[model samples]
Target: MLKLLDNWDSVTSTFSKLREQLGPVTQEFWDNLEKETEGLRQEMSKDLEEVKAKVQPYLDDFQKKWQEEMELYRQKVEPLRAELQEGARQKLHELQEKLSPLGEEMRDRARAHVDALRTHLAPYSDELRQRLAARLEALKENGGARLAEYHAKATEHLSTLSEKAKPALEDLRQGLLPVLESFKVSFLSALEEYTKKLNTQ
Candidate 1:
């Protein structure tokens, strides 16, 4: 019976010691977990701030570079546009100068051609008049025999020649008038266009 009481007392003492140790260990474990969670949270906050700081300068630089590039592009293109306009104006001026003389020369040549054509037709005029007079005399001698038929045939032949000459006369007018007018209009239009471009600039 005494041995049994000793064994019971030893078991009770061991249980008390284990309970005391477990209380402090459990409290320590919970405190350590809390500390680690707080440290992780602080570390995450610091890392996030660092990341923002690292990215902010790049964003600022990108915006600045974009603006700079756009400004540079504008500078380059603006000058090119001006240069192109100036070149066009200069070229148009030169063309107008050249065209003015060319149109005058063309008109002079057309006038000379008309004069030459008149000179050539002068010889044919007297012969045609004489032939008509001869035909009328022959009709009188025949007592106006077949006079209507002869007149009709002669008129038809003369009209056919006149119809052929009509194109030559039209050619002279068309070949000279529009060319001079075109040169005048082209010069004026080019000047106007250049003025408009300069105003825009």
Candidate 2:
């Protein structure tokens, strides 16, 4: 069930890439295969949509809850935002005052310092980039460490959804799997048989 959608996606992709090139070549056979292949997808998709419609409310409710949760988070962070902004502005003002005495001294050396800074940065550029990339690559490598909390939170929702989805998933699969299996046994075999005939051409 978890991988059912994944299976459909794989075949749809395979047929798209291989069908016109490798499918039944004669007109009657082509039309028959088309009816089989496309209709197989169409009918399963119809069932899927019906099932999709049945489960729409869970997502709608979850979506509404998510929006409410977002608003809750937004409201919670507003005060932190004001405080942080105030603190940042206060620090910038204090920094400007503390550093004011250096303005005249720095203006005196701007042109010379610009060139000097560029010169100083240029020679060690490759090493600087390599070191920075190493640090960045190491951080990327430890991505699991960073998303450590993310796994717990994401899986928590999946667990919640799976629990909520129990009756729904049960009903959906119970209703739909028989149809899906029948298509697999019948339509898919017809498709492969036609492909074999077409392959000989």
Candidate 3:
């Protein structure tokens, strides 16, 4: 009966020691995990900021270039419009003059040439306007899409890191509170000791 009691006490003591050891080990593991998680969160935040910085300049440049190109197209086509109108007027005058004195065959030929020139120049003018409009629309659509995509990606990256790190950070704070309090007491004790020594000296 005494032997059994002694064995029971030994087992209880061993279990108590095991529990104590496991508590600190578990706390340390959680603390290290929180530290790693916080590090990752910080790195992710920095990366997201960098991505924003990089993409912002590109977006700005794209918008500026699009505007500049549209302006250039307008400037180039404005002068050509006057020139096309003048050419059409001059061709009409030449056709009228030639057809008045010449036979019906000559009149017909002059009329055909004048019609052909008008038809060709008409499509060219229309094409120039259409091309400018299409290019502007394309630039606007593509730029908006790229900006939205980049913003979404940055948001997701930050959100993912925050979600993963939050719980670990909470766990770390709870587990380390005692250690932090102990450290504070030791620090104050050391400061008091130093002050005492200074006063004595």
Enumerate clash totals for all models, in the order shown.
0, 0, 0
Models 1 onward score TM values of 0.23, 0.33, 0.27
Q: Across residues 39-116, which tens digit of lDDT does each residue of candidate 3 receive?
A: 889988998889999899999989999998999889878988898999999989688987767777776878998898
Name the best candidate (by TM-score): 2
Q: Give model 2's TM-score versus the native structure.
A: 0.33
lDDT (Cα atoms) of all candidates against the true structure: 0.84, 0.82, 0.86
TM-score ranking, best first: 2, 3, 1
Inter-residue clash pairs, candidate 1:
none
**Model 2 pairs in collision:** none
Candidate 2 per-residue lDDT, tens place, 22-128, comes to 65466668788888999988878898789889899898989989998899889978998888999899989687988887886778769788888888888697788
Residue range 1-201, candidate 1, lDDT tens digits? 476778878988898778987885657887787888897898889988899899999999899999988998888788778878988999896889978898999899899988989898988977898989998898797866678779989999988996789888988888777444334577799998878898763
Please give the lDDT score at residue 118 for candidate 3. Answer: 86
Evaluation by TM-score, superior candidate among 2 and 3? 2
Model 3 TM-score on a 0 to 1 scale: 0.27
